[PDB]
Amino acid sequence: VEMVSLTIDDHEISVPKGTLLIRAAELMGIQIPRFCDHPLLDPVGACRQCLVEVEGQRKPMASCTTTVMPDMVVRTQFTSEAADKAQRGVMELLLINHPLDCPICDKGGECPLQNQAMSNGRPETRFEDVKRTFPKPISISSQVLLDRERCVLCARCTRFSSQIAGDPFIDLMERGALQQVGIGQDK
Amino acid sequence: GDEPEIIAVRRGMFGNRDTGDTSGYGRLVRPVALPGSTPRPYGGYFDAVMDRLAEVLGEERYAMSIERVVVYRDQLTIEVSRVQLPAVASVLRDDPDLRFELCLGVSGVHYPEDTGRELHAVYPLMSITHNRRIQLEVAAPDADPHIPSLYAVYPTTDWHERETYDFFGIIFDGHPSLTRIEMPDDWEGHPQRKDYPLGGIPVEYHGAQIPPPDQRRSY
Amino acid sequence: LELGQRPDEAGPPISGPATYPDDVTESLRADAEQIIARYPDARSALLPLLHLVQAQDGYLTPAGIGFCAAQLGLTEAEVTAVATFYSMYRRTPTGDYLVGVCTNTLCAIMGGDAILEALEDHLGVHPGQTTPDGRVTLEHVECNAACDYAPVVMVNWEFYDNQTPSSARDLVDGLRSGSPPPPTRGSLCTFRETARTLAGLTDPNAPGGAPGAATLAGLRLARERGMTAPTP
Amino acid sequence: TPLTPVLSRFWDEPEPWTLETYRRHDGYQGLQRALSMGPDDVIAFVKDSGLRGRGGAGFPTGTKWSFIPQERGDQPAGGPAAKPHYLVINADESEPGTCKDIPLLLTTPHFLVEGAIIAAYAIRARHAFIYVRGEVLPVLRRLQAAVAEAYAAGYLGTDIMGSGFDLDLIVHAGAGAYICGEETALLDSLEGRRGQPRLRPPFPAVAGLYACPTVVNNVESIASVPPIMVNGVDWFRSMGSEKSPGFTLYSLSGHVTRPGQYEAPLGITLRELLEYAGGVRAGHQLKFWTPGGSSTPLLTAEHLDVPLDYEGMASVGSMLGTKALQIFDETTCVVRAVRRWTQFYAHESCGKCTPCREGTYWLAQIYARLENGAGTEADIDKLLDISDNIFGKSFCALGDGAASPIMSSIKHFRDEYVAHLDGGCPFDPHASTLM
Amino acid sequence: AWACPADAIYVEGADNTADERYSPGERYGRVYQINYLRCIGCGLCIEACPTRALTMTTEYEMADDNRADLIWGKDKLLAPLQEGMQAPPHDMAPGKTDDDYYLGNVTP
Numbered sequence A: 001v002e003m004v005s006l007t008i009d010d011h012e013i014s015v016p017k018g019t020l021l022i023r024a025a026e027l028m029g030i031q032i033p034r035f036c037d038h039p040l041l042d043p044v045g046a047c048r049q050c051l052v053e054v055e056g057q058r059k060p061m062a063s064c065t066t067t068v069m070p071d072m073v074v075r076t077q078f079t080s081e082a083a084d085k086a087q088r089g090v091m092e093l094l095l096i097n098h099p100l101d102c103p104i105c106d107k108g109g110e111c112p113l114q115n116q117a118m119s120n121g122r123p124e125t126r127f128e129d130v131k132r133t134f135p136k137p138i139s140i141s142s143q144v145l146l147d148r149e150r151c152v153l154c155a156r157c158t159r160f161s162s163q164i165a166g167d168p169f170i171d172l173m174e175r176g177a178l179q180q181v182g183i184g185q186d187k
Numbered sequence B: 001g002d003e004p005e006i007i008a009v010r011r012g013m014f015g016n017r018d019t020g021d022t023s024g025y026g027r028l029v030r031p032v033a034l035p036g037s038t039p040r041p042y043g044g045y046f047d048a049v050m051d052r053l054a055e056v057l058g059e060e061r062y063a064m065s066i067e068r069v070v071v072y073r074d075q076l077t078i079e080v081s082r083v084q085l086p087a088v089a090s091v092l093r094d095d096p097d098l099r100f101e102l103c104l105g106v107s108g109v110h111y112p113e114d115t116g117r118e119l120h121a122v123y124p125l126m127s128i129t130h131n132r133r134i135q136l137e138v139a140a141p142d143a144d145p146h147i148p149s150l151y152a153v154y155p156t157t158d159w160h161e162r163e164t165y166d167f168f169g170i171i172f173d174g175h176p177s178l179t180r181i182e183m184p185d186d187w188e189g190h191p192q193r194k195d196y197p198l199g200g201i202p203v204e205y206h207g208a209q210i211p212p213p214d215q216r217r218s219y
Numbered sequence C: 001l002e003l004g005q006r007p008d009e010a011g012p013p014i015s016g017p018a019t020y021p022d023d024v025t026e027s028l029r030a031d032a033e034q035i036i037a038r039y040p041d042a043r044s045a046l047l048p049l050l051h052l053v054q055a056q057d058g059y060l061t062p063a064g065i066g067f068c069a070a071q072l073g074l075t076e077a078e079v080t081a082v083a084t085f086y087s088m089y090r091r092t093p094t095g096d097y098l099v100g101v102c103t104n105t106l107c108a109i110m111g112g113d114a115i116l117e118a119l120e121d122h123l124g125v126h127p128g129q130t131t132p133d134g135r136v137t138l139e140h141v142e143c144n145a146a147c148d149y150a151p152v153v154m155v156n157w158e159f160y161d162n163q164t165p166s167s168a169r170d171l172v173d174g175l176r177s178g179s180p181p182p183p184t185r186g187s188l189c190t191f192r193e194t195a196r197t198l199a200g201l202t203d204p205n206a207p208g209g210a211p212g213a214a215t216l217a218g219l220r221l222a223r224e225r226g227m228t229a230p231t232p
Numbered sequence D: 001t002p003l004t005p006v007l008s009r010f011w012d013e014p015e016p017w018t019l020e021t022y023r024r025h026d027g028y029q030g031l032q033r034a035l036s037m038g039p040d041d042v043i044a045f046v047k048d049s050g051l052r053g054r055g056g057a058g059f060p061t062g063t064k065w066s067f068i069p070q071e072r073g074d075q076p077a078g079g080p081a082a083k084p085h086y087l088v089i090n091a092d093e094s095e096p097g098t099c100k101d102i103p104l105l106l107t108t109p110h111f112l113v114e115g116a117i118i119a120a121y122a123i124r125a126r127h128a129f130i131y132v133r134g135e136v137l138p139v140l141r142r143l144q145a146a147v148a149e150a151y152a153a154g155y156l157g158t159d160i161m162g163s164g165f166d167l168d169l170i171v172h173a174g175a176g177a178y179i180c181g182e183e184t185a186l187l188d189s190l191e192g193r194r195g196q197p198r199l200r201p202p203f204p205a206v207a208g209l210y211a212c213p214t215v216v217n218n219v220e221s222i223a224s225v226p227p228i229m230v231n232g233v234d235w236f237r238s239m240g241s242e243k244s245p246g247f248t249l250y251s252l253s254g255h256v257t258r259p260g261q262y263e264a265p266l267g268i269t270l271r272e273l274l275e276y277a278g279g280v281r282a283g284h285q286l287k288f289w290t291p292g293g294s295s296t297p298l299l300t301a302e303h304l305d306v307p308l309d310y311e312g313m314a315s316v317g318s319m320l321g322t323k324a325l326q327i328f329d330e331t332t333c334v335v336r337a338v339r340r341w342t343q344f345y346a347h348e349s350c351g352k353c354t355p356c357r358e359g360t361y362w363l364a365q366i367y368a369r370l371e372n373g374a375g376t377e378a379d380i381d382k383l384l385d386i387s388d389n390i391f392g393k394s395f396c397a398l399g400d401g402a403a404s405p406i407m408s409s410i411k412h413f414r415d416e417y418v419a420h421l422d423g424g425c426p427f428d429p430h431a432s433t434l435m
Numbered sequence E: 001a002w003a004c005p006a007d008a009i010y011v012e013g014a015d016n017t018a019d020e021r022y023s024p025g026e027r028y029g030r031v032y033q034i035n036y037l038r039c040i041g042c043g044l045c046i047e048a049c050p051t052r053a054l055t056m057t058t059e060y061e062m063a064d065d066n067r068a069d070l071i072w073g074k075d076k077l078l079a080p081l082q083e084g085m086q087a088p089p090h091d092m093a094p095g096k097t098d099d100d101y102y103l104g105n106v107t108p
Ligand SMILES: Cc1cc2nc3c(=O)[nH]c(=O)nc-3n(C[C@H](O)[C@H](O)[C@H](O)COP(=O)(O)O)c2cc1C
Pocket: D052, D053, D054, D055, D056, D057, D058, D059, D061, D064, D090, D091, D092, D093, D094, D095, D178, D179, D180, D181, D182, D183, D216, D217, D218, D219, D221, D396, D397, D398
């Protein structure tokens, strides 16, 4: 059980070799914002919400994908102004195309996007342009209704349906800003 | 110890009290710590107060009596040790340099998740002559909820100590008569404790009902 | 239930014939055996295989998706995900010639935007749309790595260098008509032929492909000014 | 500095792409020279040559090859046998302005094939793949023909040149995606997946194609191998500089007389290249230009004399990139060009990560407003803030490449950006059209 | 109802559809009850409402002999169908869309 010691923010901890920065920051009581991360899914670092400043690293690193190395130093949005700026910018970019659907969205009140836009978001929109739009909702089965505009394209659904369950009957489809979770055609 | 008191340990993000409505967000462990002891140069008159207190009490008596000193939002809390409460209160009231004539009451607060320190009685004291005020805090366990009553020093506490008992079960030993003041003498339980259920009833509606707030979900 | 995307939405979702006839799938499997045999992993042959089905139709259809999934043991969802990612997999019946004006920054500002506007006004169709004759399908393509040959016009993925708007409309008229002007650099062939070529099945001995003016400009200047590789 | 035809040498000859035409000029001699030397010997030989990667990054070819974990030793792999190495040649050339790989492949594809074989020997990869973007169907045909000829001539397959070496080469015709040009995205697209970049680590050196060791090299970086093999390291080092030696193809394109590929030593200044090309379009002046493709920060006249080499470009903040040298003059509107580049990046984004996917869309819309009548002074500050939020934060470098045009364009032409707030682009598009 | 400290509002949402549409957008309040023997008139509901569907009139006269007569339903609360209005179950105004409604860009 080789334990690697590192300092997150000012404080120090020791965690099993291979533990991700986001897991360590969880263990020490620090809420790094995250959407695409999932403890039970292989890390993908897609949404870039969980950026943190790491000593010796020019770019911010996705805490969800940064394996802990010995003697590392990390400063989250609680102590790194640069990491704070990175996370807040990712949050803004995450909300520009998002529908103004909270009153009608079932996830309202339990939405990680809402909560982390409160904790790690700008007070108000800067986006005066036109939002991306999809026709919604669309059923991907008898049970599940998909609202693509609200999709932050984190790929957690797809990553679950591949890794956890061997059921890749949805996937990320199209490309660019138009990327969308989808079933094949009608299957 | 100088480590803070953790009254609760939040698990997961978004304040979920249980498993949580989205998967993968429940792994955070955030202890709910009250402020720890202030380092030393307490702001304003606080030092002037505490130093004076430390002078009137001995070094040994002061160390055995005052468990902690916490300045928060420019408010001074003296986490006093149980048993020694009457002596400290007498010193505060009588000493001309402290002269906290006015004890404003006693308030119980229940921290079931604070081991051995479940029930805290808070004594707001004010010194009119010196225009000062502080808050004593005495922590008692749930299994031994006994605290020394301040009646001989602050008669005003008699009713407060009673209400606090009625609402928390904090047994102020030495109080003339700890009879329930708010609730009926035959009432079972101490309502302001967290273990006591809110005791509401569903609100009725045509074809439905809303359970009380303590049953429905919260964050 | 209305499962899947709405038919009228964004770039048209993969739609069309639900399945190919028996003989069509026989031929498709005959070609797919060769396509699969050349890779260390079966799925690696997905991109070629998709071209092959795009070669059968004028565009990707649910039948092609199903055939690729069946060959590679994938789900239709995964095959669709791969297919919708790449632009070369057209999602509407394509005309005999896919004419794409390179509208990239350089080509557009060197005149490509005028090329595209003139062609759109002439063919009477917008980019991505097929002419009613079914011979040409206009498009606007990103940089094709032929930037020297400014206002480059691409046709069935052959080149047409230095195209003026008049030259562009002459070229599209020739394509819609019987005989088109030859590619400045490449050998033109029908769209389905190009699809079979991208699959790695077409005969690669097709003629054409001279260096052209721009590929040589540097060597010509070196020769005319006595430059050369120094020496061993 | 002077032009230096090395790969361009054969061109203008009759059908240079043929194997006979290639052989007539010391073709496939470098393959023999390499095959005589030991694999690690060839790796060291190239590493001493420097030969920094010609596709975008500029990483040393030698070290990239060496990172492949060769078994070596006494062949002690008694347990789990070493998984196969792979050489994936990146014949994809989709960076805007970048048209050096395509001419090389079309005219003399064998430089690649030869070099590719050599590279496969260097890393000891039993298979090699040339992932060539589609949409260059002439180039794909040329490359397939070249590989078939190489098979016919015994340079591919088994017992190559009697060295005991075996190598099977596959030309993979990539579908349409710019993002496939990146290592680990080239690999996913070659694996039959969405051409999206992977995480790193694990790096391609340890686990790339099929999670097996892989090296991805630009076609220019490979086709530059046979020349150094035949002419030695000392010949290669004479060109360029120590920190960036060698020769490279420069795709002079844009508002320039005599646009084309010029094979010149590294560090050639744009002044010299324009002089060789005869300068910008007559009657106008160089307004701005890109050293590499659009992915690199814009440059202007004030850098006309700055050398075109990796260190030289880093000296100004630009990246040398692919030596695209897109040139634009007074007639062109910086905002118009940057808007089209942002449109390209939004179209070509893989969509994987929030910063690029969303910020490119937003910037494209902002630039649309700028070119149209709308647009405000705060819009420029928003453009810079969004670019900052993309640069560095995006999953792969495509986000950095998208932000680079915006950031450099603002830094150099905030005046013109402001002027676009008067009611739109003042410039007339017709004036910029190479007639 | 979320904001009501007294739990005096009960709301059940339901889908708008072409065959039957009650509000612009995908959701509408199919059931809407206020228990006025629990309502404390605080006004937090109003501040909570994001569409101004809920307002407070100045009408105050209310009293009944039944515990149940003071649980006022949706049909008791809906404001009177002013002139120019049509029955609640109908499609949006032609060409208009929920955004057009929230921006105030609608007319009879
Ligand atoms: C978005 C993106 C696109 C790229 N496209 C290409 C390309 O089309 N051709 C290329 O040679 N390199 C491209 N690269 C650079 C690759 O890293 C390069 O091909 C590969 O790493 C080998 O580089 P080297 O041959 O110079 O050593 C691209 C990089 C990025 C981030």
